[PDB]
């Protein structure tokens with residue numbers, strides 16, 4: 425049974441590459457992180473920074489989350505990210521994703537002790 429912090433790591437951290445350099449990155453990563461197991465997760469962002477750098481966002485700019493909560497934090501700097509989105513022709517179990525690489529500020533919700541990211545809210 426997965427902790428919220430561990431779920432964030434599994435869904436959103438990819439420190440092993442500096443960027444998505446292939447159109448098939450999302451198809452491979454959504455599968456290997458078990459985000460296509462019982463259904464195709466429609467949208468998911470991977471962050472290509474160290475875990476420490478992403479955890480540090482919880483001490484950066486405090487902003488509102490989309491849902492009105494006030495435990496969201498926006499990174500001061502831009503980060504390398506890859507947005508993965510199901511294509512219109514995708515449907516389980518043959519999940520298919522579009523890969524879009526970008527450099528953007530990330531916004532995460534943080535909780536707990538230690539105070540760490542538990543939800544990916546958006547990128548700007």
Ligand SMILES: [Cl-]
Nearest residue numbers: 434457458459
């Ligand atoms: Cl898993």
Ligand SMILES: [Cl-]
Nearest residue numbers: 467468469544
């Ligand atoms: Cl996401």
Ligand SMILES: [Cl-]
Nearest residue numbers: 484485486487
């Ligand atoms: Cl402020």
Ligand code: NA
Nearest residue numbers: 427428429536
């Ligand atoms: Na947790």
